[PDB]
Design a protein around this motif. Structure first.
Motif: not given
Ligand SMILES: *[C@@H]1O[C@H](CO)[C@@H](O)[C@H](O)[C@H]1NC(C)=O
Lengths: 194, 122
Positions: A5-6, A9-10, A35
Motif C-alpha cells: 500500500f506504501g 498511497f506514497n 489507513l
C-alpha cells in the motif's frame, strides 16, 4: 507478507485521471484500520463493506486505482454519479464493493506558474462503462462538419490540462484519490487483514 | 458562440502598470493557445503575448519581454496580462485572441472587441 500500500498511497507521481493507474494487490496481509483511522484522508467512504470489518475479511484480490482530480470533483468518485469525471474519465459501478480515499495534494501537485502535467478528458461520444479506461486522442467532432483528424474550429483535442495553481481555492486544488476495489469470487481469498 | 470578455485598461502615466483580463466563454481553457495582440496608431495589429493553456508555456515579442507577464487560471477560464513600466508608445487597442490549436505560433481564430490603453508622457 505486507500488502504494498506504501507504493500506492506514497507514490511520488500520480496518474492523470483519464490514464488512471491500477495496481492489483494479492497474496498479502493489509492493515486497513491504520489507513481508516489516519488523519491523512479528507475522504474515506466505503460501499458494500464496513470499514470497521476490513481487518477481519479476506478477498480474492484488491485493485488499487489512483489518479488526481480537483477537490470539487471527488464527489464524482462514487456509484451513481454524473459529470465530466464520472462520465468520461473514471466510472464506478452501481454494485461497487470498495472504498474511495482522497486527500488534498496541493503541496505535491501544484507549483509556481501552474502544474499542467495532470489532464482530464472533456469530450467523448458516450459515457465510460464502470472501470473502463480510455487513453485515445481522436479529434472530437463538436459541430456539424467532419474533422478528418484535424484539430480546429468545433474539432477538439479531447484532453485538457487542469493547470493547478497553488493559489487556487480548495475546490480547484489537486486531490490524490485511491479507489480500493474488493473482489469476492468463490475462490481462495489471498488478501487478508492481520 | 465563443466570446472573449475583456476588462481592465484605460489611462495610466508612463512608468505605471495596468492589468488586462480576458475571460473565455463557450470554450474551456486547458487545450488552446490564448493571448494578446495590440494595434497602436499608424501600426498593423501585432502579437504581444501568448500562453499555451495545455502546458503553461508563455511567449512574448521583443518589445514586451520582461515588462509584460501573461498567466492563465484554467479553472476560472481567465488569462491576465500584467503590463509594467508602460511607455507612451504602448498606447494601443489591446485584443484578447484565442486559437483553435494548442500552438501559440498558430494564427488566432477568435477575437475580443478590444480595450483602449492610453499611456500619458511626463
Ligand atoms: C506513507 O508514508 C508516511 C510517512 O512516511 C507513513 O506515515 C505511512 O505509513 C505511509 N503510508 C502507507 C499507506 O504506507
Amino acid at each position: 507478507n505486507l500488502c504494498p500500500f506504501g507504493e500506492v498511497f506514497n507514490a511520488t507521481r500520480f496518474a492523470s485521471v483519464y490514464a488512471w493507474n491500477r495496481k492489483r494487490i494479492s497474496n498479502c496481509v493489509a492493515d486497513y484500520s491504520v489507513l481508516y483511522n489516519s488523519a491523512s484522508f479528507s475522504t474515506f467512504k466505503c460501499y458494500g463493506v464496513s470499514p470497521t470489518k476490513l481487518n477481519d475479511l479476506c478477498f480474492t484480490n484488491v485493485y488499487a486505482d489512483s489518479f488526481v482530480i480537483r477537490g470539487d470533483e471527488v464527489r464524482q468518485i462514487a456509484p451513481g454519479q454524473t459529470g465530466k469525471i464520472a462520465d468520461y474519465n473514471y466510472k464506478l459501478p452501481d454494485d461497487f464493493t470498495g472504498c474511495v480515499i482522497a486527500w488534498n495534494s496541493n503541496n505535491l501537485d501544484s507549483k509556481v506558474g501552474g502544474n499542467y502535467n495532470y489532464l482530464y478528458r472533456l469530450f467523448r461520444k458516450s459515457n465510460l462503462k464502470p472501470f473502463e479506461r480510455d487513453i485515445s486522442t481522436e479529434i472530437y467532432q463538436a459541430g456539424s462538419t467532419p474533422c478528418n483528424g484535424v484539430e480546429g474550429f468545433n474539432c477538439y483535442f479531447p484532453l485538457q490540462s487542469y493547470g493547478f495553481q497553488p493559489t487556487y481555492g480548495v475546490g480547484y486544488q489537486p486531490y490524490r484519490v485511491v479507489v480500493l476495489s474488493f473482489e469476492l469470487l468463490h475462490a481462495p481469498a489471498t488478501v487478508c487483514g492481520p | 458562440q465563443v466570446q472573449l470578455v475583456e476588462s481592465g485598461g484605460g489611462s495610466v502615466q508612463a512608468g505605471g502598470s495596468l492589468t488586462l483580463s480576458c475571460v473565455a466563454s463557450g470554450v474551456t481553457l486547458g487545450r488552446h493557445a490564448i493571448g494578446w495582440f495590440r494595434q497602436a496608431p499608424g501600426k498593423e495589429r501585432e502579437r504581444v503575448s501568448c500562453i499555451r493553456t495545455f502546458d503553461g508555456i508563455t511567449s512574448y515579442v521583443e518589445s514586451t519581454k520582461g515588462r509584460f507577464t501573461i498567466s492563465s487560471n484554467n479553472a476560472m477560464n481567465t488569462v491576465y496580462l500584467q503590463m509594467n513600466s508602460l511607455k507612451p508608445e504602448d498606447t494601443a487597442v489591446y485584443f484578447c485572441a484565442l486559437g483553435v490549436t494548442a500552438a501559440c505560433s498558430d494564427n488566432p481564430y477568435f477575437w475580443g472587441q478590444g480595450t483602449q490603453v492610453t499611456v500619458s508622457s511626463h
